[PDB]
Amino acid sequence: NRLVEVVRRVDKAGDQEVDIIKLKYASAGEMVRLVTNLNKDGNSQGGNTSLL
Amino acid sequence: AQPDVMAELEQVVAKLDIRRAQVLVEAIIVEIADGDGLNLGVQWANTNGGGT
């Protein structure tokens, strides 16, 4: 009970899903560029951080 | 183009497709011409005396 508790737990602990909502206005590619400079939003080679 | 450029091109087009105004151009060419020649001349020829 408490083992599988641990497992589903560690499972739901680190969720990683995708969400898509339409952009009606400013370019997705500019959206990309401007946010890409938001480095460390998953964009790093960090070791124990595991930010990948 | 990107939706941001689509909206930008849409204003460019609307400005650029403005109903071009028409011009009625009347030219008026008036010329007036005349002038007076005059040739009067008198010749006297005499068998006895001489001629001009």
From Swiss-Prot, chain B:
The protein's location, in the record's own words, is: Cell outer membrane
| Superkingdom of the source species | Bacteria
Role played: Involved in a type II secretion system (T2SS, formerly general secretion pathway, GSP) for the export of proteins. This subunit forms the outer membrane channel.
Record note on domains: The N0, N1, N2 and N3 domains are periplasmic, while the secretin and S domains form a channel that is partially inserted in the outer membrane. The N1, N2 and N3 domains each form a periplasmic ring. The secretin domain forms a double beta-barrel structure; the outer barrel has a diameter of about 110 Angstroms while the inner barrel forms the central gate with a small pore in the closed state.
What interactions and quaternary structure are annotated? Answer: Forms a cylindrical channel with 15 subunits.
The entry's family comment says: Belongs to the bacterial secretin family. GSP D subfamily.
Protein name, as recorded: Secretin ExeD
Per the UniProt entry, what species is this protein from, by scientific name? Answer: Aeromonas hydrophila
* Gene designation per UniProt: exeD
Shown residues in whole-protein numbering:
332 to 383 of 678
